[PDB]
């Protein structure tokens, strides 16, 4: 059984919510949870890893993510 990695999601206001995900988890789930907790529609936000857009069906494995990596959230363009 694989382990959770813990990712830090940084908001435009520098707030942080951390999420534990497995390496094969689709990141849509993280995006939806984050948007829910911010009180905004998921499609109003864009989520970036090292500046690149995170797709709904990206996984941490596909993105090469590791423990304590950062996701930045910006308003959708």
């Amino acid at each position: 059984e694989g382990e959770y990695i813990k990712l830090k999601v940084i908001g435009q206001d520098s707030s942080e919510i951390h999420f534990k995900v497995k390496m094969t988890t689709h990141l849509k789930k993280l995006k939806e949870s984050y948007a829910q907790r911010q009180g905004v529609p998921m499609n109003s936000l864009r989520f970036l890893f090292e500046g690149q857009r995170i797709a709904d069906n990206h996984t941490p494995k596909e993105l090469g993510m590791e423990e304590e990596d950062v996701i930045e959230v910006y308003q959708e363009q």
Binding site: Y4, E16, I17, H18, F19, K20, K29, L30, S33, R37
Partner: peptide
């Protein structure tokens, strides 16, 4: 000071 927030991201019985 914000506190730490960690969120974990993890039918025949139906009746409707």
């Amino acid at each position: 000071e914000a506190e730490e927030r960690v969120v974990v991201i993890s039918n025949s019985s139906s009746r409707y």
